[PDB]
Amino acid sequence: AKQDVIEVIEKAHNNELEPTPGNTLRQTFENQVNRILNDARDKTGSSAQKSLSEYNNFKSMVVSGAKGSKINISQVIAVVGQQNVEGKRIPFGFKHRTLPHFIKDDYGPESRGFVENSYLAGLTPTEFFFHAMGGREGLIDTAVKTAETGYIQRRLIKSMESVMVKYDATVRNSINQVVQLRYGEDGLAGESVEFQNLATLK
C-alpha cells in the first residue's frame, strides 16, 4: 500500500495525474490516496479476521454482537489505519509539514497520519500524537452535540405537547383543531404493528 501511494505521489509531481471531472487536482489526489489506504486497512482487517481460531474470545464477543464490532478486531491485530480530522486527512499545522520531524511537502502515508501499527504492537511516537488528534475530535463532538440535541428535544415537545387522540379517534391539538382525521392515517397505535411483505406486489 505504501508503495502504491508513492507511485500516485510521483505521478502528481510530474503532472501526469489527470483530474476526475468535478474535482480539483487536489481533490482527485486526496481521493486516490484514500482509495488505496482504505483498501489496505480493509484488506489487512479481513486477513486478520480469517486467522482467528474458533476458540478466540474476541470472535466470541463480536460474532454474538454482545459487544465490540468487527472493526475493533482489525485495529487490535492488524492496522489502526488512517486518522482523520474534520473528515480530512491530518492537516498541516506548521508551514507545509505536519510535525517538526517530517520534511516540507510530504504527502506520504506516514506524514499525513496513517498509523500502520496495531494497538498490540504499539503506536510509534508520532502515530501516538496523530491518534490523539483523531480522538480529540470524538471527545469534542460528544460534548457539543448533546447540548444541541437537547435544545431541539425541548422545542419539539412544547410545540406538539397537547396533540391527543380524541374519542372521535380524530387527532386534535389543544384548540380542537383537526391535525388528522385518523391517527397516523390508519388509526392504529404504533406498538402492535410489525413488518410484512405484500407478496402480490413484485
Partner: protein
Amino acid sequence: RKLRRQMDIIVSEVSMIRDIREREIRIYTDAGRICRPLLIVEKQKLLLKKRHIDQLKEREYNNYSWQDLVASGVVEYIDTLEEETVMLAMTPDDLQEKEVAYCSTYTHCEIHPSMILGVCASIIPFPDHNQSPRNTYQSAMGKQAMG
C-alpha cells in the same frame, strides 16, 4: 545562534527565527513564550558525547549539572514558532545512514519521545497501546485517586 549556545550576550531564553521565503528574521525576547529543550545535531552527529554523560552520571559532588550542560552548547531551548525552521530526529537512530535518505539535514534531536506527556498522563503504563480517549479519561481519574 553561536552566541546563544555560549550564553554570552544572549540568554538561552531568546528565540531567533530565520524565515527564508519572506526574507524576515525575528528575535523574540518577549515573556510568555513556551520552549522545551532539545539536543543539538551538528553534521550527522549529536553534540552530546560520552564524556558529558559520564560527568552527569556522577553529578553528585561534581557541582556539574544541567546548567553546565546547557552552557556547553549541547542542549538548546526551542520554542514553538522556531520549531517551524527545525528538523527533529526522534532518536539518534534516525541519524544513522538508512541507505534511503529521508533527510540528511537533521538539526536537532529530541531527548526522549515520551516527555510529550504531562504529569497526569505520565503515570499510565504503555499509553501507546490504548485507544486515545482512554489516556484522556485516566488523566481525569488520576486526579481523584485516594492516596
